[PDB]
Structures are given as structure tokens and as C-alpha cells.
RNA sequence: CGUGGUUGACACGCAGACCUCUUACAAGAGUGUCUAGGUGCCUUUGAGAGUUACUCUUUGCUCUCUUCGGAAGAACCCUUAGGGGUUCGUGCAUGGGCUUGCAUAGCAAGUCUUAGAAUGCGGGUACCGUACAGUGUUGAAAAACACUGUAAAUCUCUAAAAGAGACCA
């Protein structure tokens with residue numbers, strides 16, 4: 001139980017009601033967490049490897065993750081030209097990438113639920129819930145939940161943007177999710193679900209485990225951008241392209257706060273291999289292995305670890321992580337055909 | 350063709366695109382119609398007799414009508430206790446009321462459709478339609494459909510009060526109805542549906558046939574309300590209290606407009622019976638039968654027709670119209686049981 | 699970017715972009731490679747309903763009739779082509795002399811030249827060429843061939859806005 005607490009809490013940087021999470025992990029054998037993605041565009045390393053690590057941690061803790069693939073949201077935002085078949089193909093491509101990189105799908109503790117199929121199977125238990133949340137929460141509160149999208153004082157809203165937050169908030173209760181690990185973008189929807197749970201008088205509020213938003217590889221990009229193929233490593237990139245991107249990534253010397261490379265290491269490399277091996281010249285301390293972020297940050301602040309040796313090591317580790325994906329997509333004919341089909345689809349926005 | 354057009358146009362008071370109405374009644378042999386109707390407890394003379402006259406005219410014009418029982422909307426607005434099963438029983442009771450007062454169910458021209466059943470049957474066609482209408486119509490426009498529930502523009506709405514206009518706007522296309530008849534308040538929703546139909550380039554835009562709203566009996570109130578028994582008469586009322594209502598109803602002599610009694614005459618007894626018999630005193634010209642509203646109002650203006658003679662004749666005509674309802678209630682065991690259940694249930698706004 | 703070159707490549711000096719390094723963008727060094735577009739044609743008919751809402755004015759937005767037809771042209775179909783039809787594809791401001799405010803002349807008011815499409819802007823269409831991506835053939839690489847899209851993919855993707863008074867301010 002305590003080990004489950006540590007593993008689950010390690011998933012997200014912010015855990016609302018840690019005492020409630022403790023109670024949930026003590027009483028419920030398998031918590032049913034919830035995280036989702038819109039099957040569109042490319043897939044940044046943050047999304048891919050962070051969700052893989054989070055899901056592996058949750059399954060090791062014994063969590064029945066219910067991934068929500070938002071194909072109606074992609075269609076309504078007009079992704080891949082608003083084609084359901086193209087969006088399904090992109091979703092299958094992403095899921096195959098994840099299966100290659102390490103999602104424990106074979107363990108049976110991870111379920112990949114499509115929004116369209118699940119909704120059209122049981123909407124009589126879903127759309128009443130969306131109407132209930134829309135009725136119980138007022139227009140000002142719902143509009144405040146949609147400011148993060150960029151629609152609010154900045155942009156005129158299309159009622160669809162009063163149905164989107166309501167549907168995303170009702171997804172948690174439709175999936176009976178006891179935990180939420182959505183990104184910081186939808187923490188507003190998580191809080192909305194919490195207050196709805198207060199309204200409907202439920203003693204088991206959904207825990208929030210918002211994943212830390214990876215800053216972009218370029219300086220100043222606090223928000224992870226998957227639409228600009230210059231400030232984010234994508235798991236479909238080649239080895240040389242990944243090396244170039246990491247070499248061009250921002251990395252201030254002797255600065256740990258706001259360091260894209262250090263944060264990349266902390267939440268991607270260390271959680272995977274339980275270590276960060278760096279090979280350096282004899283004048284630069286030689287070969288040394290860092291087993292923890294504590295000694296990593298201590299040495300980096302002291303200046304013993306320098307970017308000239310740091311970035312090659314990070315690039316090699318990222319290539320080692322991405323190699324299963326590239327090998328799987330080169331070897332499996334179905335995966336290769338999926339990659340070719342996705343490359344054949346031009347982005348329509 | 351022209352006879353059908355005249356019969357159809359005799360129903361509504363404001364029919365937008367009368368040219369389109371004629372074109373539809375020429376091209377199609379059986380256009381599809383609906384009426385908007387929320388089942389909530391007692392249902393007054395405007396929703397009974399005016400609605401059944403309109404439906405009878407439309408089915409005589411060889412056009413089908415789909416009765417749209419808005420039980421889902423009632424539940425999500427909480428109206429009538431917010432209980433699905435007994436709201437359905439109320440809807441069945443009112444359907445029986447319309448059957449008793451007169452409705453051609455033998456020919457299958459009328460369709461008693463419950464919103465919940467139809468949505469549960471065809472969610473995958475209806476809810477994508479709702480979201481598409483939401484995408485096409487902006488938040489301010491959806492706000493502007495506000496007075497259908499009886500509120501001012503400056504007030505604050507709930508997100509369900511934005512969900513609902515889109516659900517109404519999508520009910521038309523979900524029913525695939527060609528001519529639209531509802532209250533005068535839902536004109537904005539009907540205009541929204543028309544705009545959505547020219548944003549999706551569907552030919553044959555739905556034709557709006559707006560009804561006329563009967564005002565309150567007491568002068569100063571122009572609205573209708575089943576929760577307020579001081580403004581309208583019901584068909585679940587007894588003869589004596591109906592007479593009391595008619596005599597307490599405001600009716601100034603030699604006044605053309607603003608007379609609830611005259612409007613009730615024109616919209617209820619003249620269309621139903623093609624005539625009206627008034628039992629006048631022997632000093633006014635004896636008993637006289639009026640064949641048209643024009644001559645009736647002319648004789649009322651000329652001063653030989655007084656409220657003291659109009660009210661007894663109005664009461665007698667209304668009672669004669671309502672006799673089938675009471676006879677059906679006393680004869681049909683199922684109808685009597687439904688009425689007893691309705692009386693046992695409590696009505697809350 | 700221009701010089702010689704019909705231009706693109708090719709040498710020249712430089713502008714920018716691409717690649718290697720102290721990887722921190724910056725800053726600097728390195729040696730190199732690369733940039734494109736051009737041609738011809740056309741493009742402002744008036745009306746009405748809906749849309750801000752509490753209305754009037756100036757207009758926009760879809761909008762269905764209507765048209766010196768949404769034209770320059772594409773896709774498709776009919777076929778003996780000379781041709782016809784459907785879908786699609788439609789622009790925004792101003793003149794110059796006539797009279798006045800002004801000595802005939804900035805700009806405005808009464809008509810005209812629909813618009814000299816005249817002045818500029820932007821649009822889309824067809825051809826060529828360039829490069830990218832894919833298809834099949836000759837193919838050892840390379841390249842060539844014929845075909846299909848892109849080049850500016852990019853925001854009311856969502857339509858009401860302003861002024862004037864109601865009408866509580």
C-alpha cells in the first residue's frame with residue numbers, strides 16, 4: 001500500500017488531496033486512472049515517453065488505466081481534414097508507437113477506449129451526465145474552464161466550447177475514474193469534475209495527478225509545443241534529427257530552473273534506466289554514472305558536469321529509448337504501412 | 350395544391366417564406382411536421398385546443414405531424430418533479446387528452462415521439478448533429494435564444510441553458526421535418542435551425558409556422574402559465590370552475606384588441622365549429638349565430654353584443670368542446686388511473 | 699541580389715537560407731551548397747427575408763430568387779459538335795471637365811462616361827518552368843519517361859459592427 005502510494009505519487013507533480021489518494025490506494029485494489037489524447041498530428045517525446053513511464057508506474061502499482069482517445073474532439077477540431085478513417089489511422093499509429101516504446105498493453109491493465117465507439121455504445125449513461133454537469137455548473141464557470149484552449153476574453157467562443165469542457169468533465173465519471181492524470185492544460189476540467197463531485201455528494205472525489213508540462217527544447221518555451229517541429233523531440237524522428245534537435249536545445253550552464261535538458265533528463269531518462277550514464281574526457285572527470293537527480297543537480301550546479309558532455313549523453317539515451325520504436329516500425333509490415341499512411345496525410349487546420 | 354396551402358397557412362400566425370410553403374406543398378405529397386411540447390402536469394386550453402386544431406388542419410392537408418414529447422428537456426429543466434417514469438406517465442396522460450379531444454391516429458399521420466426514446470435510438474445521428482450545430486453557431490447567438498424559458502438577456506444562464514437551444518435546433522433535422530410549428534417564443538430557435546440549414550447547404554429549409562400565444566385572463570398579464578391558475582383554463586377543470594374562470598376573465602365591451610375572451614373565441618370556438626351561437630337577450634335581437642370573426646367583432650363593436658351575453662355563450666361552447674375529455678376520463682379506466690396518478694403527483698416549477 | 703549569361707544553374711562581391719563546431723538561442727569561426735517565377739485572359743447587376751436586438755441610419759455576413767447571367771476556367775455528363783447542361787468558381791476605394799464651397803483647378807455636393815477597369819490593390823483560373831511527395835516502366839547508383847497534388851497550407855475555421863435615442867443609467 002505504501003509502495004503503491006510512492007509509485008502513484010511519483011507520476012504527477014501536483015496531487016490534490018494526497019490523503020484521499022492514500023485512502024483510495026488503501027481501499028481500492030486497482031484504481032481506474034484516466035488520461036487521454038487527441039489522435040492527430042505528430043506525437044512529441046513528452047507525450048510518448050512520459051505517458052509510457054506514467055502508465056508503467058501505474059500498472060506496477062496495479063492501476064487500471066483507461067486511456068481516452070478523443071476522436072470526436074479531433075473531428076470537431078477538424079484534424080486530418082475531418083476524416084474519421086484518417087483520424088483512426090493516426091490513432092492506431094500512435095498506439096503502435098506506444099506499444100513499441102514500452103506500454104504494458106500485454107499486461108491487460110491498460111485499456112484503450114475510443115471516444116466514438118464507447119459513446120455510441122453507451123450514450124444513455126453519458127449525455128445525461130453531460131447535461132447534468134452543464135445544468136449544475138453555470139456559464140461563467142464553464143467559460144472559465146475553456147480559457148486554457150485560448151477561447152475567452154482573447155477569442156469569441158462557439159457553443160461547441162461549452163460542450164467541450166462539459167464532455168471532458170463527464171468523461172471522468174463515465175469511465176468511473178478515481179484518478180486523473182491529465183496535463184496542466186485540463187487541470188481546469190479536473191477541478192470542475194471535483195466540484196461536480198462535491199455537488200452530487202460523492203465521498204470519493206477523483207484524485208488529480210497532473211503531469212508536469214515539459215518545457216520546449218528552445219529557450220522560453222514553457223509550454224510543450226507539438227505543432228512546431230523545432231522545439232520538441234518527436235518519437236518518429238531519425239537518430240541524426242534527434243541528435244541535431246538535442247544539440248540545438250536550450251541548456252543554460254549552472255542553471256537548473258528552466259533548463260529543458262535537465263528537465264528532459266529528470267522526467268524521461270532517469271525514470272527509465274534508474275541512472276544517467278555520461279562519458280567524458282579524462283580532463284573532464286572521465287566516465288561517471290549518475291544514479292539520482294540529487295547528485296545530478298549537485299554536480300551540475302558545482303560545474304563538474306558540463307553541457308559539452310551532457311548533451312551527447314542525453315542524445316544517446318534518447319536514441320536508446322527511441323530505438324525500439326524505429327526497429328518495430330521498420331520490421332513490422334503493418335507498422336511500416338501505418339507510418340507510410342500517416343506520412344501520406346497532410347495536416348489540415 | 351392551393352387548397353393545401355391555404356389550409357396549412359390557416360394554422361400559423363407568422364409563416365416565414367410563404368413562397369417556400371407553397372413550393373413545398375406543391376413538390377412534396379406529404380411534408381413532415383412537428384410540434385414542440387414539454388409535458389409538465391396540467392396542460393391548458395392553448396396547448397390543447399389550438400394544438401389539436403392545427404394538427405387536424407395539417408393532417409387534412411395530407412401532411413404528417415410528429416408530436417415531440419420533450420421529456421428529456423423536462424427532466425433536465427427539473428420541471429414536474431424531475432422524475433423520468435412519472436413524467437412519461439404525464440406525457441401519456443396528455444397524449445390521451447389529445448386523443449379524446451380529437452386526433453386521427455387511425456391513418457398514422459400523427460406520430461407521438463418521445464425525445465428520450467428517439468435520442469437513445471439514434472444518438473450517433475443526433476448528438477453529432479448537436480455538436481455540428483454548436484460548431485456552426487457561436488456563443489452569443491446561442492445566448493440570444495434566452496426568452497424561450499422566460500428570462501431577460503442581462504441575466505446569467507447555466508451551461509444547460511446553452512445546451513438546450515442546440516438540442517432544439519437539432520430536433521428539427523433529427524426528425525427531418527419540413528414545416529415547423531411551435532410557440533412564438535421559439536422563433537429564435539427556429540431561425541437558428543434555418544441558418545444552420547443554409548450553413549450546411551441542405552435544400553428545402555424548414556418552414557416556420559409560428560403559433561399565437563394566448564394571454565392571461567386577468568388584464569396586465571400577456572403570458573401563459575400552467576403553474577398560475579389565474580391566467581388560463583385547463584381541460585382537467587370542472588364545468589362550474591370553468592364558468593367562474595370565464596366570468597372572472599377580463600372582457601371590456603366595445604374593445605377590439607387586448608381581450609382574452611375575444612381571442613379565445615377566435616382561436617378556439619370559431620375554427621372548431623365554423624360558427625358560434627350566442628344566447629343574447631330578447632331586447633338585443635334574440636339569439637344570433639355568427640359565421641365569421643369579422644361579423645362577430647363588427648356586431649360586438651356596434652353595441653348589441655355585451656359581455657353579459659358573450660360570457661355565457663363562451664362558457665357553453667368551451668364546455669361542449671371539453672365534454673369529450675371528461676367523458677373519456679370517466680369511461681377509460683387507464684385514462685382515469687393516469688389522471689389519478691397525475692393528481693397524486695406534485696407539480697413544481 | 700545584381701553583373702556576363704535568353705533566364706535558372708555557371709564565376710564575380712554581397713543579401714538571405716541550409717550544414718559542422720565553444721551548444722545556450724545570442725555571439726563567433728568554418729568550409730561549402732542552395733534561392734527564383736514568367737506569360738495571357740477576367741473580375742463592382744440590382745431587389746427582398748434572416749442575422750446586433752429595444753428601434754432608426756450607415757453597412758457587412760450567410761442568403762433564395764433574380765439577372766449586360768458568378769465571370770476569366772475546372773470537374774462531370776450528353777453527343778455526329780459546330781454545342782448544351784449541373785456542380786463549382788463571383789472585387790474593394792477614387793475620377794474629368796461641366797457650377798457652387800473655391801479666381802476654371804486639393805476634397806465634397808446635381809448628371810455623364812455601367813467601369814475607358816481608367817487609376818492601384820488583391821483574387822481565381824489556364825500554360826510553361828522550377829522544386830517537393832507518390833504511382834508504374836527503363837533502371838546497378840544516378841537519371842529519364844507519363845500521371846496526380848502543393849507552392850501564399852495560416853482565423854469571425856465562429857458574423858454581426860458602428861453611430862444616434864429610447865429605457866429604467
Ligand SMILES: Nc1ncnc2c1ncn2[C@@H]1O[C@H](COP(=O)(O)OP(=O)(O)OP(=O)(O)O)[C@@H](O)[C@H]1O
Nearest residue numbers: 036037038040041046047050182183211213214224
Ligand atoms: N508533457 C505532457 N506529459 C503528459 N501528458 C501530456 C503532456 N502534454 C500533453 N499531455 C496530455 O495530452 C493531452 C492533450 O494533448 P495536447 O494538448 O498536447 O495535444 P493533442 O490534442 O494531442 O494534439 P493536436 O494539437 O494535434 O490536436 C491531455 O490528455 C494531456 O494530459
